[PDB]
């Protein structure tokens, strides 16, 4: 874009290339994408997670691995990248390993696949936590499409995926992820 302010003065623009920034970044930087209102994505190292929100309790505390301390996540996976990315995400979103409720992951001994689950239901005794979590997501995902409705059950699941090729590259999410973690 451009237009004339005066006779010899021009309004001009410069637009940075996200393709250029991402593809030519020699560092292994974390990417966070909002594909649409329901599906979010995060990538770090060899780990790539799809994040989804809905009322399905994929994991249950009676059968799956309770995570109170980051080291517990050693039982969630055989890939150090998956564990590292999960810990990094829970840190960046504001989860307090000391005071907040433990979350859940699937024991790596099972073969259904890697997945971890966080109760973000905005209801009852969980409301405060949910709210905090919401705020966290708002910092990590620009224009965060909050799917969790007040008073309703809402569980976040993060599971392995391939990076959507149509994912809008947004470096602001990366800056917030690096800043908050």
């Amino acid at each position: 874009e451009a237009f004339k302010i005066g006779l010899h003065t021009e309004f001009q623009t410069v637009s940075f290339s996200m393709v250029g920034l991402f593809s030519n970044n020699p560092h292994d930087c974390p990417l966070l994408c909002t594909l649409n209102k329901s599906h979010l994505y995060i990538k770090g190292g060899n780990a790539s997670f799809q994040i989804s929100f809905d009322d399905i309790a994929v994991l249950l505390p009676q059968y799956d691995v309770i995570i109170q301390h980051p080291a517990d996540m050693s039982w969630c996976s055989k890939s150090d990248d998956q564990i590292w990315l999960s810990q990094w995400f829970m840190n960046a979103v504001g989860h307090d390993w000391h005071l907040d409720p433990p979350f859940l992951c699937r024991n790596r001994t099972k073969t259904e696949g890697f997945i971890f689950q966080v109760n973000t239901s905005k209801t009852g005794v969980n409301e405060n936590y949910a709210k905090k979590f919401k705020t966290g997501m708002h910092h990590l995902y620009r224009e965060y499409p909050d799917s969790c409705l007040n008073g309703k059950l809402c569980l976040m699941k993060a599971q392995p995926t391939s990076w959507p090729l149509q994912c809008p590259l947004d470096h602001v999410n990366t800056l917030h992820f690096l800043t908050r973690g």
Partner: antibody
Amino acid sequence: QIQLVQSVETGGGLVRPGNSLKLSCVTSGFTFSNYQMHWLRQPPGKRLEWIAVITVKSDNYGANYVESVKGRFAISRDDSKSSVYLEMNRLREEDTATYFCSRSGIYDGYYAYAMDYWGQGTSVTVSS
Amino acid sequence: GSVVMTQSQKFMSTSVGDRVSITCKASQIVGTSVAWYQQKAGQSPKLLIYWASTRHTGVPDRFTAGGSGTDFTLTITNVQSEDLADYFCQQYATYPLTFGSGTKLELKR
């Protein structure tokens, strides 16, 4: 068309206790290497039973078994032949049943062991 | 320690066009991690329901299901002759996966 067809590799389904027996399950109509495969069995007058599962290459062909067969049965797969196999050793009369191979996929966006396709069944009778 | 899937009614009678309900009670809480299957003549089962209430592609809309925790119900509306079969539940929340003993749907006369 998605197909799962079972057979007894060697001999018939009638075997004597202590013998061995390999079941096969050949498939087509889908990318076999992207799906986990299961073996189950329906004993006479008893409810359907899960036996074993084997996952894909990206997860090191990991396998899980029920306790009653651990150390006796071995699930395996050949992706180049789109086939899954159940090798049953140390057979006892309690192993008599109709054995099924099955496929599980992804359900409402999440992997879970609901069985969306099954083989036709293979009758196995362990008797002296 | 296995989760028992209890179907206490082994046989159930109905007439074509009726609505019928087949129940399943798990001995442990399994959330909605439940599937429902149809089976005839001890042949290959057919998947009907997963996550307790989601209808599988290709299943008639006569079939619905619901429930949670321990109590799950499969409902067949406008029962058709071809719906006469065994019906059984399954939990896949924990190993070993386990199935109900089955409820056989039969015709009234």
